[PDB]
Design a protein around this nucleic acid. Structure first.
Lengths: 124, 252, 68, 155
RNA sequence: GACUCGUUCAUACUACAGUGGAUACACCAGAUCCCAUCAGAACUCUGAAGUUAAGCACUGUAAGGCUUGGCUAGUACUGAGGUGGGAGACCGCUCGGGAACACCAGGUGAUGAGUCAG
RNA sequence: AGAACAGAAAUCUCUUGUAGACUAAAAGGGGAAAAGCUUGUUUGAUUUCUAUUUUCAGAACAAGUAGAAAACGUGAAAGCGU
RNA sequence: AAGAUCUCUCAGGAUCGCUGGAGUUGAUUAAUAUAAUUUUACCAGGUAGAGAUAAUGAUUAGAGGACAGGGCCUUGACCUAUUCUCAAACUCCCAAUAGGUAAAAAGGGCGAAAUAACUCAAUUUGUAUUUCACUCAUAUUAAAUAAAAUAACUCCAAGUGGG
C-alpha cells in the first residue's frame, strides 16, 4: 500500500547533539580551536548548521539523538534514546492541504494519529 | 468551548462554489468582464488557459448572462491528431495548443488576415485577453507560452516580454517553443546515466522518438495545424431505523 | 415548589408577600395550568413511558432524534 | 443638524444578512441606458461611488453613463417643492427597475389581444380589470360539511 | 462516462461512515534547463512509475446546520373612530391591517456553453 | 498537543480555527485568494476642465461623486491610480 | 405669518417661505395637463413586536461530565446538555401606519433606408440620430375617482420672523 509517513526539513551538526545553550557554547569553543564551520539557518545568539535533504537528514538526526509515548501528533520527538532546530512530519497524501489548484484538505481517515507514528517509531 | 457548534454553523458563509473548489476568483472575473456602458454589446474575448497535470486546455470564452459562451477550443491531447504523442504539459505543446486554437478560431471567423486597418509596411489587431487561471505568473509560466502561440497563430493578445527568459532572450524563447530545452535535458541526462534517462523518458523510448526528433515533429505539426480545420427516501429510512432498534435489542 | 399538602401554606405565604408589593397581585395555585409539563396527568404518563428525564429541578422531554 | 455624509450607518448602511463582497458576473451586464428607470441601492462592498443617505431605495431615470458611473435623475422634496436632482452613482449601486417590466408585459399581452381581435375584426376592450363586485353563485351543502360556531368560555 | 468554462451562491455547508475509479481528474516521480524559495514544503519546470489510500464522484447516518410548508395565531401587535369603560395605571368596542420564536412535517439541489472517450 | 529559552518579560512547531484579529486616532459602518499582514516596483499627495452631490437660499466655502483634455505611474494583462 | 437661513445675532435686520396686485400662457370639446387619494405592478425599511437554547452586553439556578483549591472525599473553576430574568443607546427574525417609483400618441411598436470624426475586423458590427414606412387601445375608455384650468407661468411689492 501507499499510506506510510514521509519527511522533509531537518538540520544537522558535527558534534554530539548537546541541545540548547550548551551546543552554542561548545560550537564557539570548537570555532576558536578550528576556523571551519557550516552554514546559516532561518530563524527570528547565533550558531551554524548543515542543511541536508529530508529522510537522510532524519536518519542522521535520530542516531545523533541516541512516559514511553513522549511523542505527539506534531511529529516532534524532542530529545531521547530544547533548541531552535528543525523537525517534521508529513502523511502520504498531504500535498492537497497546501496545493493551490483544487484546494481541499487531508481526510480524518488519511491522517497520522498517535498510533501509526508509534508503530513508525518502533519500526525505525 | 467546542467552538464548532450550531451558532458557528448559523453564522457561517462559505460563498461561491468555484471559490470553494479554488477556481474562478471573481476579482479577476469582474475586471475581465467590465467595459464602458456606451461601449455596450461588444465582447472582451478571454483566451482561457488552464493547467492540468496531464495537459493544458485552451478555450476562447465570452461571458454572458446565463453563463460563459465558449467560441473555440484546443486541449493538448488533440496534438495526437497532429502526430505528437508525449510531453503534454510541455512549453512547445502549450505554444502549439494555443496556436491551433487561434488558427481554428480564425478559420471559424473566416479570413486568415486578422485586421482590416493594418500598417502598409514593416478581434481588432490584438483584441482578446488573458485568463490568469490560478497558476502563478512567474517567468517561464505556461499561460504566456500559450498566449505567444495564439498571437503567432492569428488571434493576438496584449503582451509584455516579462515572463520569458532574460527578464528578453528571443533565441531561447525560440528554442523553448521548438522543444530544444527538453532535448538538451534528455541528451544531458542520457550522458550522465542511461537507466535514469530510460526510466524517466520511458514513453519517448517506446514511441522511438529521440531528442533530435522533437524539433522536427513540432515543426511538421505546426504546418499541419496551419493547414487543418441511488438516493433513498424517508419511508425506507424510517423502516431502517425501526429495524436497527430491534437489531440493537437482539445484539446487546 | 413543594408538596400539594402544603399548597395552602404556600398560597398563604404569597398572600403575606402581596402586602409588600405595590398594587394588585394574584396568587395562582394550579401547576396543571402552570405547564412546563407540571400537570399530574403529564407527570405520571411521561414518567411511565420514560419520556421525561430529570436534569434537576425540572424534567426534560425526549424527542426521537439523533443517535443514542 | 450637525449632519455629515453617512449619518445613519447602523440604520441604512448596515449589510444584508451574510451578504459579503457580492460581485458576480451577471451584476454588471444590463444595458438599457439613456431611457431606463433605475433604483439606487447601497452595496456593502463598494464604498467608492456610494450615494448620499436620501437616495437609498429611490428610483429615477438614467441620463448619463460612463465607464462604471451612472448619472440618475432622482426626485427630492425640498420643503415646498419636489425637484429633479442629478445623482452621480456607480454601477454596483444601480439596480434595474421593474415598473418598466410591468408596462412592457401588459403592452405585449394587450398587443397579442389586439392582434387576435384585429384578425377577427372584433370589437372588444384590452383595458385592465377593475376587480369588480362578485356575482351570484351556488353550492350544495350536506349536514356533514357545515359547522356550528359559538363564542368560547374562558379556559 | 468523464472533463473545461461557468450560473444560482449551503437543497450547493459541516461532521462521521461506506461505495466507486476504462477514458479522465488527482495523489505520485525528478530538478538539467525556464523558475523559485533557509527548505522542489509550496511555487515553476520536466516526467508518467505506481494507486484508489485520500482529494474527486455518489450514497448512507432516530447526524448537526441550512432550507420550504404547516402550526404557533387572528394570539402578540397595530392605523383611524368613540361627551366608550376605568379614580389612576390602563382596558373593551367599531371600521381595518396583522407578527416572531419555539414546535411539527417535508426537503438536502437545479442549470447555460463547449470538449473528450464509450 | 508537543520543543532547556516567554507555561509566567512581544518565542518555536503541528493540528483546530467566519474573523471571536486587524484596519494610526474617535465611535459606528464596511472589508478574508483582502481594504488585514508580508514583499516587490514605485510618487497621480500631478497639470487643466466640467456635469454635479452633501450642508443649502438649492449662494459660498469646505468635503465628495462621475468623467473628460494632458503627461505619466503601476501591473503589463485585463485593469487600477486626480 | 409667529418655520427657515445668515447676521457683535436672541425687543432687530436681511434673504426663503406663506400674501395681494398686475400681466401673460391655455382652458372651454365632461379630457388632457393635473391630484396631501386609492388600484395593480414594483420597491425601501429594522421602529412596534419578538428573542436569549442566534451573535453583543448582561444574567439566576441546579444536573451531567476529565484538572485546580481545601481536608480517597469535598469544594471549585472548566467543559456539556440544561435553566431563570433581561436592553428603545443589543439584533437571528420581524409588522401595521407612513413613504417612493408605475400605468402609451411631442410617445411607443416592428421595419427599411440614410449620417458619423463614436464603436466594432466589420464609414448598416453595434450605437445614437434622421428620413421614409407600415400601425398601437381611445363611439367611452391604455385601473379607479375627481365644481380636475379656481390650473400654469412671469413680474412687482406687502405683512410676518416672540407663538
Amino acid at each position: 500500500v501507499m499510506r506510510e509517513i514521509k519527511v522533509n526539513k531537518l538540520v544537522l551538526n558535527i558534534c554530539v547533539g548537546e541541545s540548547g545553550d550548551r551546543l552554542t557554547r561548545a560550537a564557539r569553543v570548537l570555532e576558536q580551536l578550528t576556523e571551519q564551520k557550516p552554514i546559516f539557518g532561518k530563524c527570528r545568539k547565533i550558531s551554524c548548521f548543515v542543511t541536508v535533504r529530508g529522510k537522510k537528514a532524519l536518519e542522521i538526526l535520530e542516531k545523533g539523538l541516541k512516559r514511553r509515548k513522549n511523542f505527539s501528533d506534531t511529529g516532534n520527538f524532542g530529545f531521547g534514546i530544547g533548541m531552535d532546530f528543525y523537525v517534521h512530519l508529513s502523511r502520504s497524501g498531504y500535498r492537497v492541504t497546501r496545493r493551490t489548484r483544487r484546494r481541499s484538505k487531508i481526510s480524518k481517515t488519511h491522517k497520522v494519529t498517535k498510533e501509526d507514528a508509534m508503530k513508525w517509531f518502533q519500526t525505525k | 468551548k467546542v467552538v464548532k457548534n450550531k451558532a458557528y454553523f448559523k453564522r457561517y458563509q462559505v460563498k461561491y462554489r468555484r471559490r470553494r473548489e479554488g477556481k474562478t476568483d471573481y476579482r479577476a472575473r469582474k475586471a475581465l468582464i467590465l467595459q464602458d456602458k456606451n461601449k455596450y454589446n461588444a465582447q472582451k474575448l478571454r483566451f482561457v488557459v488552464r493547467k492540468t497535470n496531464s495537459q493544458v486546455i485552451c478555450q476562447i470564452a465570452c461571458a454572458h448572462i446565463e453563463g460563459d459562451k465558449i467560441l473555440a477550443e484546443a486541449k493538448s491531447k488533440e496534438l495526437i491528431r497532429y502526430g505528437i504523442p508525449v510531453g503534454l504539459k510541455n512549453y512547445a505543446a502549450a505554444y502549439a495548443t494555443g496556436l491551433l486554437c487561434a488558427r481554428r478560431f480564425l478559420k471559424s471567423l473566416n479570413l486568415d488576415t486578422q485586421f482590416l486597418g493594418v500598417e502598409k509596411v514593416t478581434r481588432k489587431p490584438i483584441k482578446a485577453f488573458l485568463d490568469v487561471g490560478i497558476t502563478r505568473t512567474t517567468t517561464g509560466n505556461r499561460v504566456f507560452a500559450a498566449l505567444k502561440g495564439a498571437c503567432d497563430g492569428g488571434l493576438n493578445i496584449p503582451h509584455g516580454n516579462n515572463r520569458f527568459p532574460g527578464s528578453f532572450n528571443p533565441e531561447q524563447l525560440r528554442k523553448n517553443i521548438l522543444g530544444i530545452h527538453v532535448a538538451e535535458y534528455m541528451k544531458t541526462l542520457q550522458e550522465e546515466d542511461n537507466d535514469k534517462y530510460k526510466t524517466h523518458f520511458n514513453d519517448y523510448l517506446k514511441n522511438n522518438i529521440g531528442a533530435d526528433d522533437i524539433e522536427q515533429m513540432y515543426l511538421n505539426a505546426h504546418e499541419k495545424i496551419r493547414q487543418n480545420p441511488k438516493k433513498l427516501n424517508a419511508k425506507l429510512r424510517k423502516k431502517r431505523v425501526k429495524e436497527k432498534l430491534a437489531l440493537y435489542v437482539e445484539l446487546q | 415548589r413543594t408538596k400539594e399538602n402544603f399548597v395552602s401554606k404556600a398560597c398563604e405565604a404569597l398572600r403575606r408577600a402581596k402586602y409588600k408589593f405595590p398594587g394588585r397581585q394574584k396568587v395562582f395555585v394550579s401547576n396543571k395550568w402552570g405547564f412546563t409539563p407540571f400537570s399530574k396527568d403529564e407527570y405520571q404518563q411521561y414518567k411511565k413511558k420514560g419520556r421525561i428525564i430529570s436534569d434537576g429541578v425540572s424534567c426534560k422531554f425526549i424527542r426521537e432524534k439523533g443517535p443514542l | 443638524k450637525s449632519r455629515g455624509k453617512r449619518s445613519g450607518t447602523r440604520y441604512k448602511f448596515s449589510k444584508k444578512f451574510r451578504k459579503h463582497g457580492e460581485c458576480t458576473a451577471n451584476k454588471y451586464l444590463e444595458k438599457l441606458n439613456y431611457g431606463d428607470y433605475v433604483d439606487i441601492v447601497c452595496d456593502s462592498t463598494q464604498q467608492k461611488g456610494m450615494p448620499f443617505n436620501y437616495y437609498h431605495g429611490k428610483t429615477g431615470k438614467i441620463f448619463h453613463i460612463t465607464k462604471r458611473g451612472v448619472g440618475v435623475l432622482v426626485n427630492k422634496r425640498v420643503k415646498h417643492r419636489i425637484e429633479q436632482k442629478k445623482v452621480c452613482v456607480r454601477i454596483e449601486h444601480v439596480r434595474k427597475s421593474r415598473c418598466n417590466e410591468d408596462f412592457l408585459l401588459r403592452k405585449i399581452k394587450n398587443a397579442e389581444l389586439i392582434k387576435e381581435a384585429k384578425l377577427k375584426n372584433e370589437h372588444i376592450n384590452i383595458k385592465r380589470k377593475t376587480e369588480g363586485p362578485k356575482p351570484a353563485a351556488m353550492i350544495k351543502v350536506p349536514p356533514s360539511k357545515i359547522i356550528t360556531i359559538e363564542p368560547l368560555p374562558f379556559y
